[PDB]
Design a protein around this nucleic acid. Structure first.
Length: 32
DNA sequence: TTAAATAGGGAAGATAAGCAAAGGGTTGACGAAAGCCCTTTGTCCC
């Protein structure tokens, strides 16, 4: 009947990082 | 070197699988109540 095994797991295929926030101007975004 | 006046309510804490086998565990010493025989000492008889 093709029953699922007792232990079966999958890893994570999309890895984001922790975002960082900075304050800049709309016309001088070079320095943060 | 101050008097008072209070300090949040609600929800919720995951599941599955398994815990090993083999080998050995020491020795010696801790008796009373008589039987017989011999020796010695002492008493008594012949």
């Amino acid at each position: 009947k093709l029953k699922a095994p007792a232990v079966l797991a999958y890893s994570r295929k999309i890895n984001p990082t922790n975002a960082l926030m900075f304050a800049v101007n709309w016309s001088d975004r070079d320095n943060t």
